[PDB]
Amino acid sequence: SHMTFVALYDYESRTETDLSFKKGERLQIVDWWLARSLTTGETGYIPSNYVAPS
Ligand SMILES: COC[C@H]1O[C@@H]2O[C@H]3[C@H](O)[C@@H](OC)[C@@H](O[C@H]4[C@H](O)[C@@H](O)[C@@H](O[C@H]5[C@H](O)[C@@H](O)[C@@H](O[C@H]6[C@H](OC)[C@@H](O)[C@@H](O[C@H]7[C@H](OC)[C@@H](OC)[C@@H](O[C@H]8[C@H](O)[C@@H](OC)[C@@H](O[C@H]1[C@H](O)[C@H]2OC)O[C@@H]8CO)O[C@@H]7CO)O[C@@H]6CO)O[C@@H]5CO)O[C@@H]4CO)O[C@@H]3CO
Ligand SMILES: [Cu+2]
């Protein structure tokens, strides 16, 4: 119930395994967490310090 987060900052993917996201984008969590964007539906790793509980 606690696994929805929101991006605090924009992030641009660096690698083939991380996920880009925009500030305010919500992420469902499945230092680096596997997440699914609730905007794009894409799944990848995000830096956990860039998101906070939503
Ligand atoms: C037009 O479709 C009719 C569809 O309408 C209703 O769905 C709503 C949905 O309820 C609503 O959600 C609140 C919103 O959807 C948004 C998603 O919630 C959000 O996650 C995001 O979606 C992402 C996906 O997460 C990504 O996965 C990706 O999707 C693309 C697929 O990549 C996996 C790609 O393959 C392709 O999808 C095809 C699909 O193959 C997987 C194909 O299935 C045969 C076909 O889908 C049919 C579907 O079978 C059928 O189901 C009964 C029906 O679906 C309706 C929902 O039932 C209804 O629910 C209320 O029609 C579909 C279309 O014919 O076609 C798919 C499209 O080609 O393409 C995917 C799109 O890129 O990327 C998306 C977008 O980021 O964003 C969603 C909204 O943009 O809206 C939905 C309707 O648009
Ligand atoms: Cu929870």
From Swiss-Prot:
It is found in: Cell membrane; Mitochondrion inner membrane; Endosome membrane; Nucleus. Expressed to high levels, and with a high degree of kinase activity, in certain fully differentiated cells such as neurons, platelets and macrophages. Isoform 1 is widely expressed. Isoform 2 is expressed only in the muscle. Residues 4-54 form the SH3 domain. The phosphorylated form is termed pp60c-src. S-nitrosylation is important for activation of its kinase activity. Transmembrane segments: none annotated. Forms a complex with polyoma virus middle T antigen. Interacts with AFAP-110. Interacts with GJA1 and PXN. Non-receptor protein tyrosine kinase which is activated following engagement of many different classes of cellular receptors including immune response receptors, integrins and other adhesion receptors, receptor protein tyrosine kinases, G protein-coupled receptors as well as cytokine receptors. Participates in signaling pathways that control a diverse spectrum of biological activities including gene transcription, immune response, cell adhesion, cell cycle progression, apoptosis, migration, and transformation. Belongs to the protein kinase superfamily. Tyr protein kinase family. SRC subfamily. This is Proto-oncogene tyrosine-protein kinase Src. It comes from Gallus gallus (Chicken). The chain holds residues 85 to 140 of 533 of the full protein.
